[PDB]
Amino acid sequence: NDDDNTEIIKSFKNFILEFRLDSQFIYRDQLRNNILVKNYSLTVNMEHLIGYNEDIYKKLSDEPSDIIPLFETAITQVAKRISILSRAQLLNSLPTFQLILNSNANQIPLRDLDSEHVSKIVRLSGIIISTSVLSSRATYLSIMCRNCRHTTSITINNFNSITGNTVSLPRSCLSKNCGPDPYIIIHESSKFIDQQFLKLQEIPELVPVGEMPRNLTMTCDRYLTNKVIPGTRVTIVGIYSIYNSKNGSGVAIRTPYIKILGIQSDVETSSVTMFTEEEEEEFLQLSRNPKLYEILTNSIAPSIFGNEDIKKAIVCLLMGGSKKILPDGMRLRGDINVLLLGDPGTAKSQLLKFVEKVSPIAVYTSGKGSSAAGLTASVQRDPMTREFYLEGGAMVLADGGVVCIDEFDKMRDEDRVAIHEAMEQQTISIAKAGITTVLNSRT
């Protein structure tokens, strides 16, 4: 039982210590650079693992949830080996290292997931619609008894592979005549990590005919948290597993969910500067071009013919102005507004979608299917605890970017007056059900 685990750990250690192409051991230097900056994590490219040996890839693809903790403890063993001197024999504050995977396999649409993808590694893409608040998870628990009153420690991993996975309390004491489970939890001298929940929605253009989009639930932990914001297209690599809901129709039902292993995002969470040196040099070189203005102006909607001043206005809007502040506290606006008011057939709507696509943060909405309460701030109540809480609309979702509104005249007169302050001062004030909050929205 234990020998196979040791063999697998040894195989992974040999892989990580031996993998070199040309004259560089890439993973060891990656570990060094990660430890030096206090980022106890490692990234494995799947193609390298396949090329090194196929049996390890086969085992990982067969039972991922069981295999992965062995790899993630081999990583920390190697890190302690290649970072700490034994000195013929301390702090040793190195937790279990996080494993991150990347792959280039075929994508699978959300609606195509079925009973045959249970406990398998899958890759898929979607849109982020909501992020949950972070929560704590125990990893090393100090357990104390009452009658015999001794000390014990429990080590728990985050992978489950099954609904239970939980050793709540050992039956009987450790050897007089104590109870069944006479233990408590010593909250001090305990170690905790962080977990977060996310909701994913199907990409609009792959929705089947005459259907509505489907949502799914994903869970991430440690360094993968606090990475994605609502409204960002992402590519996820994870495990499609199921968990029971004893609190919650039918018989023997099990709600599926996704455990996040790796996230790729187009924006790369850049919006302080994090760009590569080569990219910064390329941007400076492009800015040195004597005719960058015409190059960018031609770039705005190349399939639209004739409009020039409109394209210049679009470029000036996307670039944006300069925010200013004053000693007495008065704010000054730093955005530019463009209104297109013309005859039909002049391709007004085709520019809006292109501007939405270009901008890093943009939302496209119609003035007909919209409401004043549904744009700035919606006051909802939790069905469980019955408490008022504030849910954002569309204008707050596009803060720091641009908002695309078409058919501005069809919008109701009552609705169109709410945007007055939201643009004249870029701050919205809500006084509903005793909630008095000033919310920021710059767009």
Place this chain on the structure above:
Amino acid sequence: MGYYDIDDVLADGTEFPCKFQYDIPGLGYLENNPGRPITKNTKLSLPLWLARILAIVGGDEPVPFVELLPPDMFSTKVMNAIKTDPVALDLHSINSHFFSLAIKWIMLFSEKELANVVSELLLQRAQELNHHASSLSINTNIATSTFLLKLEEMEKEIYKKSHESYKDTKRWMFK
């Protein structure tokens, strides 16, 4: 102290609080009404390059014309803040030429309690500087950038030189 040094020249331009220890008729013409003389104990914010010499000239009881008040940059609060945890301190906001002005201030006024604390501060920050410099990519979290934006003006030169040295060594090593 180099005549043709840009950084020293820039650091010489900061303003220090000071007070007119002596009353001089006809002064203040460069700040207020020229015909109105400046009275005694008048507080002003003067640049270093003249406050240093006007406070030592004397002129003539050979009291100098101006007396330099303790600047707010060197206060007990900052001393406690740097003594508590210097590695995480955002010393860039307090000043951009902090080290050079500290050198000049300690030169004008010998204070054995400043050299040791400043030395310990920079010694502690140097290890983090080297740790970040040795971390060559093979693209980073928020910690590296948020430390890098807390740096002093002069520390950037050390960081860049170390990074270039390590990059050159790595480039020559792997070919």
Place this chain on the structure above:
Amino acid sequence: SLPAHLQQTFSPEEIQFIVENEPIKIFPRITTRQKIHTRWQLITTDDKALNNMVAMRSTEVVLWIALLLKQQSKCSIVAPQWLTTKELDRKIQYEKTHPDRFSELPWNWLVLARILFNKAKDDFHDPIHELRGKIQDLREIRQIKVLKGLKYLNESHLQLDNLSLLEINELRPFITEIMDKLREIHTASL
């Protein structure tokens, strides 16, 4: 020369040049012993070895001459003693058993290694990858020891008994600047 700040420290190319300006042993493939023919008659190397030479015998030449002959089929570079597994094992054991002393090692460390692995690939009796891995492990150990030792920087002096050329060069600017700053701070304080 100036080139910005390149007047204060050596470039890695200069380090490689100064290292490769060193003697080495060679097993020649040809013979040019004088008929008892053009004299080598160099100006910065003993030509007696190059002129009085015979095949399948040991002799000492400068490293760059050995490399030039290795580019042709006139050379067979003899590997040094410290490029073998049985010596590197006792070496790594020495560093592991002694957590305070830098091990004795020639100052041409890592550089002769890079050059020999680059050019003299087929003349090693031991497999190349194992030797490269052992060298990498030694590099990691010495890096850890250097980081451990750097934690204290006195303003008076410092001692580093067994650091190679590249290790000294890659650390010179940071240590030099920090020590200069500390020294001038102390000097201004008194």
Place this chain on the structure above:
Amino acid sequence: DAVFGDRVRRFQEFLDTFTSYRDSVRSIQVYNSNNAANYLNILPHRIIISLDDLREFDRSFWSGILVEPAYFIPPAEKALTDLADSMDDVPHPNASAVSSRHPWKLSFKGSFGAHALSPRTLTAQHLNKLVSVEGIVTKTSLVRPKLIRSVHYAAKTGRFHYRDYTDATTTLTTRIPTPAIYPTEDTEGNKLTTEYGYSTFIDHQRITVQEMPEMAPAGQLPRSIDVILDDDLVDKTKPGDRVNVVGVFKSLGAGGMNQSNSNTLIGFKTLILGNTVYPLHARQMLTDFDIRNINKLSKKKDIFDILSQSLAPSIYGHDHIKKAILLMLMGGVEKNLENGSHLRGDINILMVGDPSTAKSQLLRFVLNTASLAIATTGRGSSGVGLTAAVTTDRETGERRLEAGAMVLADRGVVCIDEFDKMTDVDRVAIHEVMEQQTVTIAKAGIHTTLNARCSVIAAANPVFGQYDVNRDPHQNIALPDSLLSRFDLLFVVTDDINEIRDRSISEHVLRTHRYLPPGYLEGEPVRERLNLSLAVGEQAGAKLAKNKGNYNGTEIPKLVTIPFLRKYVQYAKERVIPQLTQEAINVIVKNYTDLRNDDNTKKSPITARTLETLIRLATAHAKVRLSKTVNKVDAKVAANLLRFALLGE
């Protein structure tokens, strides 16, 4: 084992080293003794230590406190209690009160470094560590006492027994749980009667603090954390207050690791045991030379014009608006009579004008410079939820009223934008407040009258896109006259086109935009900054550093800074209560009679309530110059301002 004693004696050594805390403790003791039997305030047994001195004394203990307070604070508290017991000297104590056993809990102040966080920054690796968090008070719970130690007596034995109870939130260290079962029988079966008046009960309240929405990530809602505090400081502050709370951040509860869990994804509960609370206020006490300077400025002839000009220096013109705002921020006194009931005391101002004439900016300035103010938008508010709400508390299971927007602004000022766009229904909710400054809630079995004595300032647009000077003033304003008659001052502003004014305002606005923050270059945008270096903060009269106010020279007339003006307002609103005299009465009656019988066109009709406005304006102007009597000059200036606001120059 013995480490507790070692820490206790080390802390005793540290306490003996510094002699300030001993002086404070003996002062508290002597004050408490004097409060006992001499012909209602008592000092709590709490002392605040500055951990800077602790760090300067012993770094090991300082680090132990700031990393793992669970093993360091209790020994310090025990040592402090032992010192207090040793120094105390009471020869004839009481019976029930002697068994209180207050352990003299501590409070901290000084630099925290990396342990001063925000509600969003709190994460897993900051657990079990002393922290200090800034934020805004969202909502509070009800004060409910909880048991600590019970006292029992048996008639047959005649021996008083006691049993002690503790919970997870009671103490920093986890211990074996004890239920609330009352011991009623002895070991030999003797009856035990619970003795009230000898047992111990401590107050308990829970509050929730929210991160400030101003410093939030783009497109992210604010997040909040909850704080538990007990015993002293149990009912400090209120919802809608900026606070800094220092305490221990620890987890509690099994959190599903027992058999009660239903699903895999079970998270723990986190909570902060607050140690101390400080008012942030983005300080509030005048110094001696501050009072000297205030008197020296008030004895000048033209202080009021200087103060009016000092308000919002980046707004061109509108000088009378600035004077009106100055008089409104420090309005007249309220009157109560045994037969006349109550008389309104403050001033409300309404402005109407065509777009782009700098009304909202002045409103924001008034928000920033006021002691207390609340921002409200007409469209984004509901009248029923503006005054009070009904919410069921999760703990007690009962429904209690939650304070509305205007109630929080009691004795403050409320600014409403887009007032004319605000729903007609909710308008009546405003009128009630304008009637008697009291809101009555009679719903779901609660009948209560809530005090709300605030002033309201609003700005509204005319019915048309631009003001029509040739039309009826009632025609241009959508609001009914019933509420318009309440406002004391009505202002109409128009952007008359004139090339001279256009050039002047263009030069001014261009001058404003060419500004650079001190010490920061112009090539890069503004970057966020960290908190203050000091978590909790705190030669005279010869410097005038910020007393004179003129930061930059631009005109012969003087200027004053915002902090000095706010200090002036704080001093004036408290230290002076002027009384009117007959000399101003004659002028007031003469000008009222003249204005009423001038018999010409006017912006609005006038009635008897305008004389009350004149009286309180004269009172406000008497307050401005810091006099206890009202002079005729105040009547003259009030009449001039009213004529400007109603006739026009």
Place this chain on the structure above:
Amino acid sequence: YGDLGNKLVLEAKRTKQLYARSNQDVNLPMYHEDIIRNILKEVSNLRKNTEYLKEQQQLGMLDDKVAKCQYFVTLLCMERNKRCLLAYQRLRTDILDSMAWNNNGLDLMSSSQQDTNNLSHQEQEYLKEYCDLITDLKSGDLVDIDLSGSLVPPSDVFIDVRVLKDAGEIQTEYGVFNLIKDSQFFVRQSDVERLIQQGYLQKI
């Protein structure tokens, strides 16, 4: 008053960054002599004021302390302005010599800025004088050494070279090279360094 002078010096710092980040001699920025001559005009006004003040001091109606303090203040003003101007010009001359020393002293007008008109006429004549000095320096006892040659140590004898620009045929010692566009040579390293420095060859 010399605050405007700081505006120059700060700008100079940015130039050093252009020298620093590039680590290469290219595109020296166009001068700022307008601010300099404004400073010269105001310091001339300062000198005139000082001479007038000294005149009144020698006349007798002026107080000695006022005269001495005004003289000290003005002298500090002149000193700081001169310091700023010299700090600018020293760096300018240093970078000028920097790119003058490596291009064989010919200034490479055939290829770097084209017209070099962003330099002042005084700076241009200084550049010509320094090129004259560079030409004279290797005309002494070091005539057999190319001082303006490569500074990378020679590491290999034969390299592959790929043609970058088209030309005819160029004679060498004992041979001739015809520069056909897009051709690859297998020649000696030390025979094509002059061409490589000029930019006619690529893929070292």
Place this chain on the structure above:
DNA sequence: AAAAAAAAA
């Protein structure tokens, strides 16, 4: 109990 969307008057 309080906010928000829909069809008919």
